[PDB]
Design a protein around this ligand. Sequence first.
Ligand SMILES: C[C@@H]1N[C@H](CNC(=O)c2cc3ccccc3[nH]2)[C@@H](O)[C@H](O)[C@@H]1O
Ligand SMILES: C[C@@H]1N[C@H](CNC(=O)c2cc3ccccc3[nH]2)[C@@H](O)[C@H](O)[C@@H]1O
Ligand SMILES: C[C@@H]1N[C@H](CNC(=O)c2cc3ccccc3[nH]2)[C@@H](O)[C@H](O)[C@@H]1O
Ligand SMILES: C[C@@H]1N[C@H](CNC(=O)c2cc3ccccc3[nH]2)[C@@H](O)[C@H](O)[C@@H]1O
Lengths: 442, 442, 442, 442
Amino acid sequence: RYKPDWESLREHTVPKWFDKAKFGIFIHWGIYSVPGWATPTGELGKVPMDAWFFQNPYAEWYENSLRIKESPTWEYHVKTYGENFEYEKFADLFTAEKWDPQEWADLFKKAGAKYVIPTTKHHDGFCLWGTKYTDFNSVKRGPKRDLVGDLAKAVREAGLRFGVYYSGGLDWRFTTEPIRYPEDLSYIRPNTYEYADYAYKQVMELVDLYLPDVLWNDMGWPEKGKEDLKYLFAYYYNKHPEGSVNDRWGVPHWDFKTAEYHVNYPGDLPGYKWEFTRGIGLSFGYNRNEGPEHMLSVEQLVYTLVDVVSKGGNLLLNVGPKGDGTIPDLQKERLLGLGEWLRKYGDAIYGTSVWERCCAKTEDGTEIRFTRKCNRIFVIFLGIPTGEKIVIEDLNLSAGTVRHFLTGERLSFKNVGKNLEITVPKKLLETDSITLVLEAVE
Amino acid sequence: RYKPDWESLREHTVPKWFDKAKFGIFIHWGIYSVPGWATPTGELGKVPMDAWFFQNPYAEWYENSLRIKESPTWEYHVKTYGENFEYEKFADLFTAEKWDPQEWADLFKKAGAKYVIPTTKHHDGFCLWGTKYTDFNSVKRGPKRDLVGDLAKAVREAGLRFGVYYSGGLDWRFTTEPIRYPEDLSYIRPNTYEYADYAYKQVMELVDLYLPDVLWNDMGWPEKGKEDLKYLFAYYYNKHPEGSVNDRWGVPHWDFKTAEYHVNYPGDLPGYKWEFTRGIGLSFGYNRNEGPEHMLSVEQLVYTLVDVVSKGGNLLLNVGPKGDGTIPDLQKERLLGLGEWLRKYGDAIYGTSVWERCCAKTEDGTEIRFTRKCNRIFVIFLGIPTGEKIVIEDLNLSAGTVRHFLTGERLSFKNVGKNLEITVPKKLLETDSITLVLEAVE
Amino acid sequence: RYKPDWESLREHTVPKWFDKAKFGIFIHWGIYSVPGWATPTGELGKVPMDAWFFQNPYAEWYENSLRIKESPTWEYHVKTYGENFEYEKFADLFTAEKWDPQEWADLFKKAGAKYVIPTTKHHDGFCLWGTKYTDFNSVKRGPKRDLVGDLAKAVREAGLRFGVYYSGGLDWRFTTEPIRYPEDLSYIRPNTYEYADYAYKQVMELVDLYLPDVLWNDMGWPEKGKEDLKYLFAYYYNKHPEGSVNDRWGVPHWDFKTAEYHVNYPGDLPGYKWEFTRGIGLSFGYNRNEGPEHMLSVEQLVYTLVDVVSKGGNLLLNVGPKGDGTIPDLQKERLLGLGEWLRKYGDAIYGTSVWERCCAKTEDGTEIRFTRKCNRIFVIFLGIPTGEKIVIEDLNLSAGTVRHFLTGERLSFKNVGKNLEITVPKKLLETDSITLVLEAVE
Amino acid sequence: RYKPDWESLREHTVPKWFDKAKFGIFIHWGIYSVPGWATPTGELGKVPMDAWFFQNPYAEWYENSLRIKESPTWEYHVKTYGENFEYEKFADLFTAEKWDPQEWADLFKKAGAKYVIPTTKHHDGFCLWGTKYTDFNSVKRGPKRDLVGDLAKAVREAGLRFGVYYSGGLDWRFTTEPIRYPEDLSYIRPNTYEYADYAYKQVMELVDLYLPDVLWNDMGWPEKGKEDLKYLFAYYYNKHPEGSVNDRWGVPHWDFKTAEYHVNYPGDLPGYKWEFTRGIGLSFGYNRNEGPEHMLSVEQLVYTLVDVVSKGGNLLLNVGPKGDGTIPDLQKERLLGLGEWLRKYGDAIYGTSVWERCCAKTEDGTEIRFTRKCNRIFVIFLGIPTGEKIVIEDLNLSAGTVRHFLTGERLSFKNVGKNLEITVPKKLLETDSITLVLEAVE
Ligand SMILES: C[C@@H]1N[C@H](CNC(=O)c2cc3ccccc3[nH]2)[C@@H](O)[C@H](O)[C@@H]1O
Ligand SMILES: C[C@@H]1N[C@H](CNC(=O)c2cc3ccccc3[nH]2)[C@@H](O)[C@H](O)[C@@H]1O
Ligand SMILES: C[C@@H]1N[C@H](CNC(=O)c2cc3ccccc3[nH]2)[C@@H](O)[C@H](O)[C@@H]1O
Ligand SMILES: C[C@@H]1N[C@H](CNC(=O)c2cc3ccccc3[nH]2)[C@@H](O)[C@H](O)[C@@H]1O
């Protein structure tokens, strides 16, 4: 068994299934989904942090924004709901009237996801399972239902892995003051031993009820509770060796690291397993304010996934459901576009490993990414070059054979100096969908 | 007064009464006494630990065994009680209908015990006093009575000392997973700050309500609560300097050490005060599965006590009452047999001190133990030699006079080399009961 | 950069070169090599620890055995060197007059080894390099030569990786009392702040002077200096990302685990990179009392490496040189036999990965081990079956084509129930050297 | 074995020999003995601490008093030795030219002492043995002799136990500023890691070279080195189970407590082994300014020992020798008087135990003290009553027979109310030496 200590826990590494899966779906869903509103200011890492909490683009941060008087959210709220309308009242209006978990699971599978991870409890402290440690949960209020449980059953019946997200670092049911600046995060926290217990008992409870494939913590773990993780991790791994944990615990152990929008995003092979997460738009929770101008297009999604995968990561794309449980059309379409692309090109993504280098580019600026499967090297262009003559810069191959992936057609190539030159018959070029893919066999 | 710190607490040592008492009665009694069933596999220390929790001979471990599906206990339970019958339901069936505390106290006194210590709360977390910190106690469920309190009053009225046992290290009301291997004990524990408080408040509460003569902890103390013991010990000793604590706290202080069945059992004088504990059978809680083949015989009990005492220890013999509060006949008879022996030979046991050596043996293999009272040395044979000529190996005496204990009759002896030779007139030999005892006066 | 904390050091994992190397050479060489003597009692894990330090088979523990009077070593030393000859005096006799590092390095390469690791400082605290932190080193006394340095140049010239062994945990230059029982190890240690600084400074110096490929600590790291490792490991990896460290530091981080003779030997695949270490005989240091009866045969060596490799490990085989710098023939002879088999079957060892299972066996009991390389699955029999019909118990294949590894000859096979049946023509069976090796392409 | 942790060290208790010894000799001897001078202000506990360091009666604090300019010591030093004569220079005048250890040991035995403890290193940091950790020791300077060693051989030859005094807490070789107020002690200390190692290494060395019977630390142990004591005490007891340590280390463990002049003197029995220490005069070091007016008389010494003994303690009486190694007559004279009374009444002191109470007094106020030996109760009058009818206030006896201790003469007595009345014939009263001693057998 694993013993409750970091040295011993280090014996557990990211499970194969996770490394091989490449793509998963995040779901930020909660009472904040009811107001479903945020100012779509921009991407995390590009918006100045002296303004960010005041024009927060993360709609799941509604309550914190509402607590900042005279922030767009406050004005919005008072004009739509009134001032005698507390945030907590949304728990009663969160009825998931149209929710159908098998439909969600069907959709995420058509999209190409191999795992799914919903918010079991986000910063507002509202719980989506019938926890026995708080009455502010979905069985007692709103949906009158075990959202986490019913979704885990549907995902698993679809053949996908199921994880859980928990806001261990923050819980607004234990604070009153909102976060206005990044600095506040250092003192405006539950801070109590009672909260460290609560968080431990709630994650232990999710382990016992659903034995998730992934424990996805957010915002660090209560300082008073960090030592508890030795036991929790050992407890978790002894019941599920193929389980995994991310790196937002702030303790020595983790199975894979994370990056959010621009933050900690690698420019090259990082050297450890990681996972990229972002909303389809600029928010994780649903935002009725976002239009397609705020979202990635299917093409960008595809390019995002390939960049991630070529660097050894997994993409954890977030979908933001409505309070009624339906998935906005703008999101469903992109999930589908991506699913379409994975059906054609998935063999150069799932099950691959990184190669000597992640990246290259054609003489004209088209970006290229590589993935590998034993002796097979996939060459994925971010786009489809117009001309049959492709000049790839600073690359030489020793393969001897280079095929056009989709058709399997052997192609003509030769190293011309510091470059590699290939000729792709326009008939084939016109065959690819968003990316020209080639396969080199060494 | 004692100050709340180890250096200062070290000033308190095992009280005289404890050192001089030699023999006490443990009582493991609780809702587990209702099913009163275990597989009598063998003695702790001789059973392989990779099997022990799966065929646990400690019937008080019923709930943990029940949690291991398809363990003898699980099968037993389902066939006797059914699967829709939770362990906690036994709290209602635990009615102590026939319980009479003065009868118990009468009996333990006839048995020769000088102190008594019942389980106030065992691993299953059920409490035998009206604690104000949990409703899972005997005043609210089952007996509708303060078992601890009413027993303390009866024991004390009988002239005996009263202690309390508390399972500080384990409490199954805070965990779900059972202990299957010794290793699990390192992570499957309450683990919370709330539990460390609970345990502190409950022991403080027993101190305040009953001011026990002994605080007998089991399974170590919550890591988060260890520092609390400085205050609790100081608090306890300032109200009762003659109080005492065992060594199962896992902190610097203790007044006497312990050993259970074969574990930590000394082969010779240990050098500190200790106490030996074991069931009359192989379990502490009642086990309707044990027959006399599993129990010590009165003779073995006597030999056990003498070995213990010759080594500076006290024997804490456990009796396992039934759910109705009566003491199984097989147990009552051995308590009595021992009481009979202590009435005759008690002066070579109570109030004694160890001698230069604990042990010897006759040329034919009879084992011998010694105890002392000033200039008087008691020579206790584990059995009664058949022949009038007794040759004790590797021993010389300088006493000059050796009497036959029970009759007081001066006897003939002389050191023959490396041995001591004595002649015990068969009339006298036939006078002793389970042990031939001699007394040497130096 | 790697930062000085466990969570960031977690990012560094065992380098590819180490995982692919499979076989390395350990060298326990020092002033203890001069007396070169020990009682060849038995293998670690098989000798009772109540006797072990008194009849110690590790000749490099000579100083410790010498300090125990009335130990065979003590007897031997007094009759051979005299009661007045201090252990430290051996540094003057350690002359390494016949030492030729290139010759050593060439033998290690001819032997099939990919990396070499000498003891830079063993428990007696004598250092085989010109450390500036002690005068008890090979530059000031004995050889008047930097053995570590000269050997590192030599090993690298032969194209092999060079790691360093350092005794962080013990240093008999800081103690006077010998280790007699395992328990003694818990307190007979340097214990000072001074020692913690010494060890840090000395490993830092080894990193600075030689940038080893492997930092192999032994016996734990001084408690007071444990936090220093976050700084030392970050410093080391930042200078040498492809460097590696073992698991004998007693802190959270490590790149690969270790097993010594029977201790911690895996029965099956363990889930993490590890390395097995043992001498060719029963000692690490040269022991003149060992003859062939105490050493592994070439066949046993091959069987050992294959078993280790099939379970994901590397074999770190020890060579114990003489005080004169020569490698004893019994040792050389075995190193060469192993290298002869590696030249022939290398491709089924070097650069391989574990498969689904490590082991199988034939109807008549020949043990079988598996390794993998992409689609190629190597089948290694520990020995060569006499008949042509071979029945592999409990194994099915879905490769369609199985070849004889040495010749490439396609062979006839079929799944027969829960078994795999194969026909190997005796002429091929007669061509294999110690192991029948089959290759299955799936 | 004892393990290196407080709970295991708790197992070791004060050895029997120490408890039975009752009287030991302290020796504060060092380079401070040469100036041998101090203002004999008064007893510790009676002099105001606002003045104490400025008019210090402990002549061994000379260096500290010297550093306070305008202190009587400073005045005396400048007129006697000069402003240019550094304190350290006294090591060259400390020649011990008339030193005869056997002569010292014989005087201590003739004095009734059972153990001897010299200052191996006092606050000024000068060491009376050939330590390898400093050059400021008696082998390199001054006597050019290992005083500690030579005295240990001598004391043991006389059959007495030998302990060592070590100044763990202070060492003026690591500070420049003097102690002026009690408060200063909280920060004017060595304070370094270096010092913590020094102290550990030096006590380890004393244990190794001399295996003392008592490790008597003074002034606390450096905070940074406190954890080291678990290792040092385990190491010491494992080499010498019958060894002992005092209570001036500031860690959990100790074998006996101490009281200095009025500080911590018990008013009645305390419940733990302790030892009283003081000089014969007001200093520990030799003070040429003390005359008989500053010393205890033989009678006062006897009364002191009896009071200490009746309360369970040992008396550790200080002798302060001259720089030349001779013991001043005023001191010798008192040592011999005490030994004369011990030769006579020894049996009512040596090897005794406390009784039910320590004290009583006669109708006319003579103080009475009690000691015990099994059934024998010794009654010690601090002085000899003039009349034959003696009335002991508040005491009843149930012994039936009371004898005059010296003669054995049975005496007439009877319980008269809350008192005990006894008739002692003047001829016996005239035979006692400083104390009328009665023996009651119950
Ligand atoms: C997924 C996303 N996480 C946000 C909090 N982010 C972090 O705590 C953070 C830590 C961290 C570590 C590595 C890389 C990016 C990081 N963001 C939350 O505040 C959002 O509501 C949303 O749930
Ligand atoms: C009396 C007996 N104690 C068991 C737990 N035992 C220990 O925690 C243990 C600690 C220990 C320390 C020294 C010697 C033996 C020991 N057993 C309990 O698990 C049983 O139910 C029963 O109550
Ligand atoms: C390679 C071999 N290592 C020995 C020390 N062994 C350990 O420190 C050790 C500790 C330990 C704990 C658990 C499992 C294996 C272990 N090896 C040394 O004492 C030998 O001289 C030799 O150098
Ligand atoms: C025997 C005597 N001890 C003195 C130091 N005294 C203490 O460290 C001490 C501290 C303390 C605290 C509470 C009660 C008594 C104490 N003595 C030394 O400063 C004297 O030179 C002499 O050696």
